[PDB]
């Protein structure tokens, strides 16, 4: 798929993901949710080749849910991101690699800190205050570099995110049909229904 | 580089009647601009009142027919000499063809017989197994020459009743075996004139409740 954004503020992580799905010359859907909940306080958005994205995300989801049941314990965002990276690094040298780029937004309940991890299909992991995949960063990173503070509130994070989407909507040739925004904090994961 | 496929030409034709069916095909076998044989049978009686033809690359066609004939033999062994119905044969052939989905039998297959209500039946396949029951079907080299003629003369397409001027269609009256054989012979004579891979001989297999009968007719040898 097309655009996925992420931003880590004071006390939460916000992920924004486009709604469009295109096959051939036709937009089949304009309300697609490019994300899976891995655990109560860990959300993963994804983008890449058709089919592979959902299959990979669901496969990761199943593995983390299996870990949660076995140990009666939620893995840290760092642990989950490392697990995901290894799977992608394992995948890139396979017969047919999974062409999937992800952002992992999680709230670490132990450290009481939000955490955002950016991982591409090669298995390239980086922890960031804000991130994106594909061409999204080309348009948005200049705004984020300018406006971002680490002590920002969730509401300020959403406003800076709105500015990023507006810039994308102005200067991108593709119509990505807006974004679904989700917030990850100490209380869990919730969706912003009006954006 | 080695090419595992080839083209042996030929053309086949199946027509379903009310209580009979015909499967016809020319007897010429070719490669490029040469004639291999003027009489090389292409339509086969496979048992259980079923006739079959796999037209295109002869090696793949002979292999398929051989395998289907074998499937009929084992159907009898495994299911107490039960008769293989034409619909059951068709589905079986689908799986034979799709089993080689990634290295296809390069043939157009057609089978003909009688359904379980005694009515005439023709089934048509593509090289990778997609099939359907049909009333009329020409396959092979001159398939595009023959099919429109059959749309016109078998299903009375674009034909209306005089005086009404396009308001009322020609009614779909059934065809006798004598009438069908005329359309088959005229179809092949016409195809022989305008297609270089069609000629030499015509062999028709007619299926009725009484069994399978054969008719042979000469074609132009040029």
């Amino acid at each position: 798929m097309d655009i996925i954004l992420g931003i880590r503020v004071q006390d939460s992580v916000i992920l924004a993901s486009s709604k469009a799905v295109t096959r051939g010359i036709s937009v089949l859907k304009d309300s697609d949710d490019k994300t899976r909940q891995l655990s109560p306080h860990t959300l993963m958005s994804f983008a890449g080749e058709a089919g592979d994205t959902v299959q990979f995300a669901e496969y990761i989801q199943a593995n983390i849910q299996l870990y949660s049941i076995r140990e009666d314990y939620e893995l840290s965002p760092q642990a989950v991101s490392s697990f995901v990276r290894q799977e992608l690094a394992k995948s890139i040298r396979s017969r047919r690699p999974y062409q999937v780029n992800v952002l992992i937004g999680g709230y670490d309940k132990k450290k009481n800190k939000p955490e955002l991890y950016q991982i591409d299909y090669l298995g390239t992991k980086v922890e960031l205050p804000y991130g994106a995949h594909g061409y999204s960063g080309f348009y948005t990173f200049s705004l984020l570099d300018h406006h971002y503070r680490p002590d920002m509130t969730t509401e300020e994070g959403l406003d800076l995110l709105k500015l990023c989407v507006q810039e994308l909507e102005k200067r991108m040739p593709m119509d990505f049909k807006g974004v679904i925004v989700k917030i990850v904090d100490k209380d869990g994961i919730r969706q912003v229904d009006d954006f | 580089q080695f090419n595992p496929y080839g083209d042996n030409g030929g053309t086949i034709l199946g027509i379903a009647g009310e209580d009979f069916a015909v499967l016809a095909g020319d007897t010429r076998n070719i490669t490029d601009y040469s004639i291999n044989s003027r009489y090389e049978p292409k339509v086969f009686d496979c048992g259980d009142n079923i006739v079959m033809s796999a037209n295109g690359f002869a090696a793949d066609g002979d292999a398929l027919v051989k395998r289907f004939k074998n499937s009929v033999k084992w159907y009898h062994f495994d299911h107490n000499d039960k008769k293989l119905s034409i619909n059951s044969a068709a589905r079986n052939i689908q799986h034979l063809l799709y089993g080689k989905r990634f290295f296809p039998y390069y043939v157009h297959t057609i089978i003909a017989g009688l359904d379980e209500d005694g009515k005439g039946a023709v089934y048509s396949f593509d090289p990778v197994g997609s099939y359907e029951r049909e009333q009329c079907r020409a396959g092979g080299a001159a398939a595009s020459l023959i099919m429109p003629f059959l749309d016109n003369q078998v299903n009375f397409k674009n034909q209306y009743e005089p005086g009404t001027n396009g308001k009322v269609k020609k009614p779909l009256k059934y065809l006798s075996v004598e009438e069908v054989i005329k359309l088959v012979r005229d179809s092949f004579t016409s195809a022989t004139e305008r297609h270089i891979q069609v000629g030499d001989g015509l062999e028709i297999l007619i299926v009725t409740k009484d069994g399978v009968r054969k008719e042979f007719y000469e074609l132009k040898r040029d």
Binding site: - | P162, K170, T189, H195
Partner: protein, 226 residues
């Protein structure tokens, strides 16, 4: 295509089949492959049909003008030289393969010419997809000092070989005999061994069968007076 050329006692004969194809489809069942360059110089062409016609008409036109300029009857070597120099210049892009034969004040002549501009001499030749089938007949039955009747037989037998055994060739046999001291006789459809049999049925429709939306008279005449 099957075409042949055979020399005999007092002249030369050429022949050809009458099938023209587009791919595996027969476009024309009675094509005329025997072309006239001059009255007593005839050629037959295989390969790109438009090129064999265009190159034949061009050289035939220049040969006619040459004949008028010199007050002499055209020679086969002139047609040959003019053809090969034209074909060579275009480096095989004009796909004309011809058998050229004729009689002139020098004698009787038989040549073949290929698209790149090479020419050959012979007593018997064959060109086209049916050349091998025809040459098998020629190599089996040709001899020195053939009569006119023997050469026509050999030529038409060689064409028939191509008709029956080559899919690119078919239908009828055309012949042209060029004898010294005589007019050339063009025998269109010399043999007709491939007549279509009567159809089992007539497909003449009832009048009114086809649906019509609009009728109108087409004005083909010029603008009228008054």
């Amino acid at each position: 295509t099957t075409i042949v050329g055979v020399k005999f006692n007092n002249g030369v004969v050429i022949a050809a089949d009458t099938r023209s194809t587009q791919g595996p489809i027969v476009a024309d069942k009675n094509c005329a492959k025997l072309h006239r360059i001059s009255p007593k110089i005839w050629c037959a062409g295989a390969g790109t049909a438009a090129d064999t016609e265009a190159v034949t008409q061009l050289i035939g036109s220049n040969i006619e003008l040459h004949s008028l300029y010199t007050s002499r009857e055209p020679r086969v070597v002139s047609a040959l030289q003019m053809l090969k120099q034209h074909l060579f210049k275009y480096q095989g892009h004009i796909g004309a393969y011809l058998i050229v034969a004729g009689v002139d004040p020098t004698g009787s002549h038989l040549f073949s010419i290929h698209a790149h501009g090479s020419t050959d001499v012979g007593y018997y030749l064959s060109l086209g997809s049916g050349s091998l089938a025809a040459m098998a007949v020629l190599e089996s039955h040709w001899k020195q000092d053939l009569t006119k009747e023997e050469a026509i037989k050999l030529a038409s037998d060689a064409i028939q070989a191509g008709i029956w055994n080559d899919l690119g060739s078919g239908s009828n046999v055309d012949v042209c005999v060029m004898e010294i001291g005589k007019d050339a006789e063009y025998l269109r459809n010399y043999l007709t061994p491939n007549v279509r049999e009567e159809k089992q049925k007539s497909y003449k429709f009832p009048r009114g069968t086809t649906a019509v939306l609009k009728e109108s008279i087409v004005n083909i005449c010029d603008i009228q007076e008054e």
